[PDB]
């Protein structure tokens, strides 16, 4: 843990189904959800390498 | 896929006592939710996140459980707290747990209703065995056509436990074609209970 | 109060498709998910699907793919936001789809999940049967002549349900038993209804079984006596 | 790394959508001053069975009367941009959702999900927490005010 004065600069982009110009992972792909066996919960996926469009 | 199991199927238990119902999860999870269905009355939420109460649920329903085994308990079992209960995890359900009224044993007064000409003029007649005013609900009611066992031609229905006598009835039928009833003579049923020390039959010989 | 009014009772033939509506009120309709569940008479509950308003995003079961579809109707009034109407279309009906459908909302919460179901609609029964509307006949039941004995009638081969049967029009109510409708004999129901009377009064009185099949306007009256 | 949450020997499949408005069946942008709604049924379509330059084209619609957050009786309008529009972007992440009915099959299916903006922000501010600083404290010692 490290104390920070101000967070890094997030770029507000309003999109659906895909996260554009986001922040990457560090080593591997990070799959991330709340109650994984629950259907109504969305599953957040985060890449370590950007996929261009 | 988680599969939920419940036991006992029917809990026969007297008012004023405790009643403890059981549901068994198959995967070590987190929580469970219970519903109450009062004989056709739009099922209501009872226990919530394994131990919290919903809105309007009285204090006589105490939730409990952990791991793969989860409990329900009604501390002072009333007359209106007889129902059928269900347990739910995310989208998977149990099969049910029925609460009934306990009573001492009794004996049904056996009948045999003869095949009338009123239905045999249409081509299919009804030989109607008919039991009334008994408990327990389970019974092994067999029948015979010319002293020979038949099958596949019967539709038997039970009834529900009454609010005044707390007893049961039963009515079976034996629907055959018009060639088949006049072919035979000796028509009889068979009745067999925990509360009878002897098999009881009654008869109606056709034409006699 | 959180109301959920579901309509309505439907009888259809196999191969058809039904649309069932579910009107909600008393809360902001654009905020809360709406589950759809089905209650089989001999298999228990079964979760059909799940609709989220404000955009209409849906998900279904995986055994009900290719058949179900559901949408909503958002109230557009700047001075009345608290109502809304949901829908559900359940196509590809077969007779094994006959059950009672519900439209279930959760409650307000801090520490729980989505599936705990607090507010319940009244439900509606969707019958799928190839039988057509037919009246009941009536057939007497009695002994030939101390101990109590069963008078009664037989109300055989009708469609659809329910038959309301009264006795001597209609004050003879004690000792009266009814059975639930005997299942489909080629698509048609029957009802047994017997009344226990001491065997002295069999040879005295004339007894009447008053069948009232209301959806076909059929009415019959058989006299019951020891033949 | 889905298979570490479900099982090694499972089959993982991707489907495309099951209904809704244009805001949740498709991929929304905000680039260059216009509002694109692209059809992504060509990306989320494959199976997985546990063992150069050709680009995938995505057709795309345009509309200029949008209603964001679906407030009653309110709508916006984007003025047209003079000239053709060009954009370059990276895709860093997805929002899937799982179907899950009660059957016995070994085949999971994952679909992209849409309309709630709190998944765009909760996927970025996840490593933070705000704390309060309480300066006073008490501790026993051998000090004695000296009367
Ligand atoms: C994801 O991030 C990328 C990387 O930044 C981002 O791409 C950027 O898009 C903006 C869109 O505004 C680009 O800015 C334009 O760039 C062109 C390049 O020639 C300029 O001509 C533009 O100048 C005009 O700007 C206004 C438009 O009307 C006018 O008022 C003005 O007078 C000029 O005519 C403008 O600078 C930007 O260059 C790119 N970045 C890079 C590195 O190319 C992308 O938009 C992000 N994704 C999303 C969905 O937003
Ligand atoms: C992808 O989604 C589209 C619609 O979002 C589906 O398209 C339908 O496909 C069926 C064929 O099975 C057609 O009869 C329908 O007319 C199509 N819908 C529309 C709106 O045109 C499609 O099935 C999905 N899956 C794949 C693999 O393409
Ligand atoms: C999104 O794109 C898919 C194809 O990439 C569309 O599917 C087509 O639907 C039309 C409508 O009948 C068919 O004629 C085509 O044959 C379909 N294509 C394929 C490959 O099956 C889909 O309809 C598009 N989405 C919407 C909403 O129109
Ligand atoms: C979109 O992705 C590209 C690819 O990472 C980013 O461009 C740079 O690419 C080089 C590859 O030679 C990397 O070493 C750099 O770290 C990348 N970033 C920078 C700032 O140079 C591009 O920056 C990405 N877009 C955004 C908005 O970050
Ligand atoms: C999801 O997991 C969290 C972890 O703390 C738990 O508190 C919660 O009860 C779980 N939700 C459900 C619906 O089981
Ligand atoms: C699945 O694969 C992982 C890969 O290391 C292994 O650790 C794990 O034991 C496997 N599980 C089963 C049930 O085979
Ligand atoms: C979906 O997958 C099938 C099978 O691989 C493929 O033939 C079809 O082209 C795909 N759909 C689109 C829109 O690319």
Swiss-Prot record, chain C:
Record localization: Secreted; Cell membrane
Domain of life: Eukaryota
Disulfide bonds listed in the record: 153-209
Span of domain Ig-like: 136-225
UniProt signal peptide: none
Subunit-structure text: Immunoglobulins are composed of two identical heavy chains and two identical light chains; disulfide-linked.
Protein role: Immunoglobulins, also known as antibodies, are membrane-bound or secreted glycoproteins produced by B lymphocytes. In the recognition phase of humoral immunity, the membrane-bound immunoglobulins serve as receptors which, upon binding of a specific antigen, trigger the clonal expansion and differentiation of B lymphocytes into immunoglobulins-secreting plasma cells. Secreted immunoglobulins mediate the effector phase of humoral immunity, which results in the elimination of bound antigens.
Protein name: Immunoglobulin gamma-1 heavy chain
Boundaries of the shown chain within the full protein: 117 to 220 of 449
